[PDB]
């Protein structure tokens, strides 16, 4: 009566959607996460939705030698 996945793959999927809905659509939703990772991000870069730069979580020290400032000295105090 109830089908067999490896004999009739499409026919099992209809029975499982109808007869085991919570179980079937659990595996469906779980697969959508792997799909959404694969699909939206490239399409986002196609439409020009650039990912935001990361926010600073430490003091942003610039690279290179020190600039040799002149100003705001003890005499100015």
């Amino acid at each position: 009566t109830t089908p067999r996945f490896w004999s009739t793959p499409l026919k099992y999927c209809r029975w499982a959607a109808r007869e085991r809905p919570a179980l079937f659509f659990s595996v469906v939703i779980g697969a959508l996460g792997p799909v959404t990772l694969a699909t939206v991000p490239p399409l986002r870069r196609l439409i020009g939705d650039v990912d935001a730069a990361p926010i600073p979580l430490t003091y942003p020290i610039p690279p290179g030698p020190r600039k040799q400032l002149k100003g705001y000295d003890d005499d100015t105090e």
């Binding site: 009566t1 026919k11 209809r14 029975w15 959607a17 109808r18 809905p21 659509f25």
Partner: protein, 74 residues
Amino acid sequence: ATPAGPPPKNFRLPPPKNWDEESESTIDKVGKYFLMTEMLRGMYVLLEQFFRPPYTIYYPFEKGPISPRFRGEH
């Protein structure tokens, strides 16, 4: 279990239908499962009662109906 004489016309049930012979769309069938639609209907019937007049009598100020034939104390 059935009366004597010829069995009733179509007394015997039809053969059972397999799951894929049933006439109910997967969309209708799956939606009714996850949305719990028949339970939603019953909860709605209680809202209908909520806004209907109650049946209650304030006793002892209001009494229930008794006929002339009522049988009380002698």
